[PDB]
Amino acid sequence: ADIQTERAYQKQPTIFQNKKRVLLGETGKEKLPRYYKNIGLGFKTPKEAIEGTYIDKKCPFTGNVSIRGRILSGVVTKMKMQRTIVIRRDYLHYIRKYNRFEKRHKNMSVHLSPCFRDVQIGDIVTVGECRPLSKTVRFNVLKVTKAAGTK
């Protein structure tokens, strides 16, 4: 029901959601407490991480990942998977003989949480290193700034 699209029950595993209540609890409000945590390097947890209903075990604000290592950046190129995007990093490689540089690029598959909704391609995104999330994915999207051709 807007979450449970799978074949097993999507449940935030730290929160107990079957507490016994009294008559002022059943008549008052059906309140699901949510688990969120603070990534420790000055990234603000979004209000969608504190107010959402999405369930993601590899989200860096609500799931079981810890961000440690290199913090990087890149721009979005292809959002065609389930919860993960493709960013390309651009850099210049110095060739020593010619004393000149050359354009170079590398792609990264990177996990995008559902708290970063309405992300268009072509905007800068900070990524953060965690453990392997799948075969090719080892970074997690941390903040999304928009391209300068927005308003």
């Binding site: 449970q4 799978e6 074949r7 097993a8 029950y9 449940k11 107990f16 959601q17 079957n18 507490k19 016994k20 009294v22 598959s109 075969k135 090719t136």
Partner: protein
């Protein structure tokens, strides 16, 4: 002879790797010993460091937790009703993690009538044998007669549970990995998780 290496795959670009060594021992994998329902049979494995792995092949009991009442009792595993990975694992009655099992509610019924003095799961005809008449109609002291009735107000149960208590079989979900710890523990399904897996089993047929 299984090998859970990463170098027998293709690259992300799609190119295949020519390997740079033969299979090392720390890359090993062992066969799935699927835990079935039967009287207990565990076979210990020797894993890295000299440690132990309890590879269970048959299991019959396991302690489960009624979450909303803080009650953990050791029940009898009956059946497998639904498994959300593969459904051939239900006809084979394999106990894996997160598979929904039928347990026996009788240790929780004895806790409920001892803690709240209310008949749970009894029929409407209410044939009440005298050996539990003394725990359902006991003689109470002056301070205990108010304590039990103080417990008796919030001693309500969601009606999806009481239909399972009628037939004596609760729905439970395994939360421990039996092929690695040799136990089949877990919790009793309550509330929204219960009415999710109920309609999954109902739509399964």
């Amino acid at each position: 002879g299984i090998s859970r290496d990463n170098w027998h795959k293709r690259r992300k670009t799609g190119g295949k790797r020519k390997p740079y060594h033969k299979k090392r021992k720390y890359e090993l994998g062992r066969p799935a010993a699927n835990t079935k329902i039967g009287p207990r049979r565990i076979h210990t494995v020797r894993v890295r460091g000299g440690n132990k792995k309890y590879r269970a092949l048959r299991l019959d009991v396991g302690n489960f937790s009624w979450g909303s009442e803080c009650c953990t009792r050791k029940t009898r595993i009956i059946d497998v009703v639904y498994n959300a990975s593969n459904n051939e694992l239900v006809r084979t009655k394999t106990l894996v993690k997160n598979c929904i099992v039928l347990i026996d509610s009788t240790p929780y019924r004895q806790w409920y009538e001892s803690h709240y003095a209310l008949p749970l799961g009894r029929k409407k005809g209410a044939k009440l044998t005298p050996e539990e008449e003394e725990i359902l109609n006991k003689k109470r002291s002056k301070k205990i007669q108010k304590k039990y009735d103080e417990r008796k107000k919030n001693a309500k149960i969601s009606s999806l549970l009481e239909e399972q208590f009628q037939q004596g079989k609760l729905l439970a979900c395994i939360a421990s990995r039996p092929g690695q710890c040799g136990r089949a523990d877990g919790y009793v399904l309550e509330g929204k998780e219960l009415e999710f897996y109920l309609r999954k089993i109902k739509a399964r047929k």
